[PDB]
Enzyme design. Structure first.
Site, PDB file in Angstrom:
ATOM      1  CG  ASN A 189      -1.808  -1.232   1.292  1.00 11.07           C
ATOM      2  OD1 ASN A 189      -1.974  -1.817   2.368  1.00 11.07           O
ATOM      3  ND2 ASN A 189      -2.361  -1.647   0.162  1.00 11.07           N
ATOM      4  CB  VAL A 214       0.289   6.307   2.975  1.00 11.96           C
ATOM      5  CG1 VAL A 214      -0.636   5.228   3.552  1.00 11.96           C
ATOM      6  CG2 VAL A 214       1.591   6.344   3.737  1.00 11.96           C
ATOM      7  CB  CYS A 215      -2.412   4.157  -1.671  1.00 11.66           C
ATOM      8  SG  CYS A 215      -4.001   4.030  -2.582  1.00 11.66           S
ATOM      9  CB  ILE A 216      -4.932   3.372   3.609  1.00  9.70           C
ATOM     10  CG1 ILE A 216      -4.651   4.733   4.242  1.00  9.70           C
ATOM     11  CG2 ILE A 216      -3.745   2.434   3.730  1.00  9.70           C
ATOM     12  CD1 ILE A 216      -4.529   4.659   5.740  1.00  9.70           C
ATOM     13  CG  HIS A 219      -8.081   7.058  -1.579  1.00 10.95           C
ATOM     14  ND1 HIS A 219      -7.969   5.827  -2.190  1.00 10.95           N
ATOM     15  CD2 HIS A 219      -6.839   7.605  -1.611  1.00 10.95           C
ATOM     16  CE1 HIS A 219      -6.721   5.636  -2.573  1.00 10.95           C
ATOM     17  NE2 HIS A 219      -6.013   6.698  -2.234  1.00 10.95           N
TER      18      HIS A 219
END
Length: 169
Positions: free
Chosen positions: A85, A92-94, A98
């Site tokens: 992730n 950081v992509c969680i 978003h």
């Protein structure tokens, strides 16, 4: 223009800081990296206790939008990381980072997405949990995703490397 939303964001940010200060959460530390600018925060994530990232000290930067808390901030680790992730550049992509229905069809989009009821504490909290529990379903780091799904024993090996690198070793 009415930099009223910006001013509100600032007050929101100060409030959250006040709270982190008087009621600090475990394994977390975050605050403006300079009084003059409350929209740029520095944070430290301690590696989860009985996980491959334990004993690691991962610094990160949180950049808040002028419309906070309507939109979430961007979070990027500053040290090397190896997580499904986390993008090559540290981003950081969680889900919590978003916008709701931001994009990428989501059911659980409804609850695990950003909203004014969230906080930097909750963000940092879930990032920690992200470390302690990956999800190979995030093309953030393809190699990390593949490895975690296929050869996980090697993943744990590189993770421990990440921790040592963070320790300055």
């Amino acid at each position: 223009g009415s930099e009223f939303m910006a001013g509100t964001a600032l007050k929101r940010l100060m409030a959250e800081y006040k709270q982190l200060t008087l009621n600090p959460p475990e394994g977390i530390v975050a605050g403006p990296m300079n009084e003059e600018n409350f929209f740029e925060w520095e944070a430290l994530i301690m590696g989860p206790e009985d996980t491959c990232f334990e004993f690691g000290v991962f610094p990160a930067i949180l950049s808040f939008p002028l419309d906070y808390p309507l939109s979430p901030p961007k979070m990027r680790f500053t040290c090397e990381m190896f997580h499904p992730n986390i993008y090559p550049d540290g981003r950081v992509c969680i889900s919590i980072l978003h916008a709701p229905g931001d994009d990428p069809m989501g059911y659980e989009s409804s609850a695990e997405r950003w909203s004014p009821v969230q906080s930097v504490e909750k963000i940092l909290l879930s990032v920690v949990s992200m470390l302690a529990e990956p999800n190979d379903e995030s093309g953030a780091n393809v190699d990390a995703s593949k490895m975690w799904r296929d050869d996980r024993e090697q993943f744990y090996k590189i993770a421990k490397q990440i921790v040592q690198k963070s320790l300055g070793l």
